[PDB]
Design a binder for this molecule. Structure first.
Ligand SMILES: O=c1[nH]cc(I)c(=O)[nH]1
Ligand SMILES: O=c1[nH]cc(I)c(=O)[nH]1
Ligand SMILES: [Ca+2]
Ligand SMILES: [Ca+2]
Ligand SMILES: [Zn+2]
Ligand SMILES: [Zn+2]
Ligand SMILES: [Zn+2]
Ligand SMILES: [Zn+2]
Lengths: 524, 524
């Protein structure tokens, strides 16, 4: 039997440095986790012990910290080249800076193949990008070869900025003929590596004949066999076994997000490329694994430009930005309005004739707003100022919620009003009126929402059965601040851009801001 | 006696081409007026007949048409140099593109002295601008000399973009020592040429000892002795005689605006520089005066880049811009919101610790909105599209109105609601609620306004005795669409930027717009 060791990452999201246990800023270094210097140590150790190793990334290196803001993907090519990745699939966030922001910094600089079989280009872009990403690559491993076939979320146009000159095809439709072609080329060991989420990964494993292993991402899925080593709760066993339509057992793997774990799957193959066995588990990259000193020293050199950038003027405010708890946990605050307006601006995507924009609505818990910004420093706003407002290292995510769920969220917002608690909601594209004289659970007396399926945006009453797209913090999508109804009732969730980055981009674009308190939230 | 002919313009405001009788676009060429080619003809004729002639401009050549938008003052230097102006005073609109937009195109290119005695600079700007404008110039005229002393509105920081490195001094305080110094230099014939408005011009004539003549501007004042030749109604005789504190008769002149008239004042002086007599009248530049063919051919050559610019993309909309009368004469319309938001953005000026911005409020009659803009031309917006929305060649002006006046304006807005009439108001920084079941004059049931004297902008009830700054069309400041209360009751009026230009600048800055209907105007 021929044994392959698959090492894999996904949704690293700009965690070049070690992090806290929750993937935010490292404060207590003796208990920090992840980062590329520690990954380097572990990969190097495994490559010293195992003959046949592939190191794969399932996409979404782009977006997540000030690293991406400043280096715009150059850090991804540099550090992925230093760890000698064997292949990467394109994720949705690889399109955040458009096609141009993918071609240059990443496709032209990577020393490893970058894969997606379900993205096509037309017009002059097709010539410009031809061969810079591939449907698949056949890689030599010891005396054998392994085919790696890529895929990227069909939903990327709604979740990033790929532009109007790329088409994202159905993953299974695109994959099958490529896997069929590899079999004609005498390649009998096939890995599907891609970025569509665990549910699609299971469909690919079931339906794409000839796929031996699926290595996925996007959904930040944690799989584990046994007692988990940290706080993440497994969604299933590692690997997750799918019974294929042709009667084979096909392992499906993912490795959470943020570089906290290295996925590790051992596969035994027979002479004909059938999987005989698969076993493994993600490895927690905790402080017991030393950071490689060389990579750490390069990280520290690259940090200098981040420190410099952190104190530069992004733009100006002519108004006090009221992020005080005394305001934002009690009533509409202009900091809340600013952040929600930034959130909606970040989620402007290509719009057909059926909507002005696919999403119009935002909620933001007041507990997530942690500082004001004074306008009397010549109006300057810096990244450091925004990091005091938004200190948790979160994202502003896209969800789909029934109107009944959103009404329950607004009732929760004021259920125990008057105690300075974090659940009070700041809003965009929503007008709410509360009557605090009513019983908890029955305090929302008006709730109007901005249309999407309209040429002129205007407000209509919320409909209990309609499904709304809403931008909100990952903290709320995960049921933080008692929003268990959002976690339990949402119909779709996709992780978005870094919180600070969303607001910094908006401020830079606007140049001078003056957010008002304008009646989005009233009391009767 | 030594006789001087003073020819003078003021507030030409980018009317390089001949205009209609109302100073808008020329449609019926056989009845058009003004423009620099016709001015050239008349000036040349007078200089052939009169030995001692000065041609003076009292400021505000900048701002008013697409000429200024595209050529940014290069057209002003070029055509003022071609007509051989003898001197110009700085107007408020000469600062619309900042100090940098005055130094280059105008101060470095003019072949005539540019004057203001009451503007000082500090820091590095003082070195950069030293001598590029002067307090005064002594000009030879025949065998004599004439001193010309300039001044510029002390209110310029509120009415343009001069920046924080210029100080505008009290005009009379600054002028007196300069006029005193000219007398020590044996200059006994002194013209005060400046840009503060007719009321200040009369104060200068009264109080600045040694001023023989005041040639003013800013207030677009029309003076005439006799039956007027066109539609403008005189504010007084030409010249307007002020009795000075030292007992002299001091003539004060102005010549309306828009290049429609050439001011013409004949002064007789004695040997000691005392005015013996003054008489004259502005000359209507109507179609009986031919356009100079050479200047007209140069105007037509410069027009090519304007035509090209007119069809260029300024920015994008992802929403239908509803400028239909069926919307904007009946309810809040998103075109109205866009234009008022552009108006407030245009009037962001330097703000001390006492206000976030000096003005927060906007009204716009629906009758002034003359077209929608469709978003389905790939979202493109062009100048030509904006000219269909705003076709009248107006300005967005700054006024001061008591709250009682503004309440009367909102009652007028709906006094005869339901007939598709032009007075229905679109708004910014104002939230109004109407009850149409009430008697005309008593339909406004809520009227809240955005604060200025606040660090966080928020809405408060309108106060009847408080004076508000409001941005509104010149058409309304002049009592158009039945707003006689605005004309009759306003406390201050200053003309603003060209309507199209205000909206085009905002669209270019924003890049992608998506104005909503959001509840600024409600019905109960
Ligand atoms: O909004 C929040 N995000 C994360 C934490 I931890 C919290 O208290 N609040
Ligand atoms: O708003 C307007 N400006 C100018 C005219 I003439 C008119 O009808 N309406
Ligand atoms: Ca196989
Ligand atoms: Ca004199
Ligand atoms: Zn991701
Ligand atoms: Zn993803
Ligand atoms: Zn003017
Ligand atoms: Zn002026």
């Amino acid at each position: 039997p021929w044994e392959l060791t698959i090492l894999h990452t996904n949704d690293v999201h700009s965690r070049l440095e070690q992090t806290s246990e929750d993937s935010s800023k490292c404060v207590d270094a003796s208990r920090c986790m992840g980062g590329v210097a520690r990954l380097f140590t572990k990969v190097q150790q495994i490559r010293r012990a195992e003959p046949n190793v592939l190191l794969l990334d399932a996409g979404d290196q782009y977006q997540g910290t000030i690293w991406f803001t400043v280096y715009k993907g150059a850090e991804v090519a540099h550090f992925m080249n230093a760890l000698r990745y064997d292949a990467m699939a394109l994720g949705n966030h690889e399109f955040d800076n458009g096609v141009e922001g993918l071609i240059e910094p990443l496709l032209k600089e990577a020393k490893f193949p970058i894969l997606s079989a379900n993205i096509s280009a037309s017009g002059p872009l097709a010539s410009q990008i031809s061969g810079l990403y591939l449907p698949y690559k056949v890689l030599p491993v010891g005396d054998e070869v392994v085919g790696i076939v890529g895929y990227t979320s069909k939903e990327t146009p709604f979740l990033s900025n790929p532009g109007t000159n790329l088409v994202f095809e159905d993953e299974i439709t695109a994959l099958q003929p490529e896997v069929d072609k590899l079999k004609t080329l005498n390649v009998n060991k096939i890995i599907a590596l891609g970025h569509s989420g665990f549910e699609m990964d299971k469909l690919i494993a079931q339906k794409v004949r000839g796929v031996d292993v699926v290595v996925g991402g996007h959904s930040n899925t944690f799989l584990y066999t046994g007692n988990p080593p940290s706080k993440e709760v497994p969604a299933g066993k590692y690997p997750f076994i799918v019974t294929s339509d042709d009667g084979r057992k096909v392992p499906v793997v993912q490795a959470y997000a943020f570089g906290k774990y290295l996925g590790y799957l051992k596969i035994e193959f027979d002479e004909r490329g059938n999987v005989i066995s698969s076993h493994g588990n993600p490895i927690l990259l905790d402080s017991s694994i030393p950071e490689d000193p060389s990579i750490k020293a390069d990280i520290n050199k690259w940090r200098i430009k981040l420190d410099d950038y952190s104190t530069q003027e992004l733009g100006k405010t002519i108004v006090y930005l009221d992020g005080s708890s005394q305001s934002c946990r009690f009533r509409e605050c202009n900091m809340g309005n600013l952040i929600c307006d930034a959130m909606i601006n970040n989620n402007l995507r290509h719009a057909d004739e059926m909507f002005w924009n696919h999403v119009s609505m935002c909620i933001l818990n007041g507990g997530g707003i942690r500082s004001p910004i004074d306008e009397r420093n010549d109006g300057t706003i810096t990244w450091e100022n925004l990091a005091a407002v938004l200190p948790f290292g979160g994202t502003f995510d896209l969800v789909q919620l029934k109107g009944s769920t959103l009404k329950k969220a607004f009732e929760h917002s004021v259920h125990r009003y008057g105690q300075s608690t974090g659940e009070f909601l700041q809003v965009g594209g929503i007008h709410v009126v509360y009557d605090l004289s009513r019983k908890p659970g029955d305090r929302v007396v008006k709730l109007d929402v901005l249309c999407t399926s309209c040429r002129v945006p205007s407000y209509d009453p919320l409909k209990m059965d309609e499904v709304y797209k809403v931008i909100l913090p990952n903290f709320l999508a995960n049921g933080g601040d008692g929003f268990q109804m959002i976690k339990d009732e949402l119909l779709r969730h996709d992780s978005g851009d870094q919180d600070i980055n969303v607001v910094s981009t908006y401020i830079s674009k606007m140049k001078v801001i003056y957010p008002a308190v304008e009646g989005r939230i009233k009391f009767s």
